[PDB]
Amino acid sequence: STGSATTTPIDSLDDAYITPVQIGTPAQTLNLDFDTGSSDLWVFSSETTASEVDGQTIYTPSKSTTAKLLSGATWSISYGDGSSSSGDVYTDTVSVGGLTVTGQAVESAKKVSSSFTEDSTIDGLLGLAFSTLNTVSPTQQKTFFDNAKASLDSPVFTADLGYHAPGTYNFGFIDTTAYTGSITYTAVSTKQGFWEWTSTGYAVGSGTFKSTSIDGIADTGTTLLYLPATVVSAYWAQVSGAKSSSSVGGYVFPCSATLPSFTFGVGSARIVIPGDYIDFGPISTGSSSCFGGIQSSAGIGINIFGDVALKAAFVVFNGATTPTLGFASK
């Protein structure tokens, strides 16, 4: 089997991407944030504290003839940005782009933190990291991909995120029309439960490539590119007036600037992130200070190849017995 679904930016800055997902019988369609950095499929629901719901579409398990309470199961997750959610668990039928998994754990939120409430466009998360990170207790549950994998034509999914435009998540096949040149594959460590890999280096604009190993995660659920402070300083040094602002919480730059590109290495191959991809717009409405799309990972503890990086590539998440990651230009 295969599936193919369009993923759409939630706003004009590509702050995140949402993908429609069918849950239950009859189908209830929710727009979920596909997140290769976590492993819980959780949704706003009829059980979510009323004051914490503000415009989201909810899953109502009592209206699904295929929903079953997973008795005694609870979940609770906290992400790197300090956001969180928790609740109980149902199993139900879940379909993405024509690919159906029966008995998928659908984690129903009883509580969500303020940033989730405040984002009316995201109805939940669909985790695509390794199932070892799943938070359901006392019986850990599998991700949608982990459940689908054996049925797929090939045990892979691909992320093809757009810049200020829709893109595609495919399951079970590689669309050879969706990228240019060849796909370069690189090793993955699953030891921390992430799609963790090692970039071979970077360049800023038309500058020379610096060969250096940068270990990080391929994370569709993080907006920006978070890299070591040395690398980030080398980038922003090429932008007149750019500076790290403790009050704003990262590098800002004059909105009048033309940003240089940023290149990262995948083996001997190179992925080029155009300068425009690194502009996240005014820090507040009407400001001439703009927020940067490349930020230091120093406070985080891991480097993160988030959407800013991934959207410059066609990315293969290869779930073979020994997982790997593939990157192509597009």
Ligand SMILES: C[C@H](NC(=O)CCC(=O)c1cccs1)c1cccnc1
């Ligand atoms: C934006 C956030 N990203 C992460 O949590 C990346 C992961 C991260 O920071 C860390 C991993 C290990 C130590 S720190 C997010 C929010 C909501 C849903 N998904 C992701």
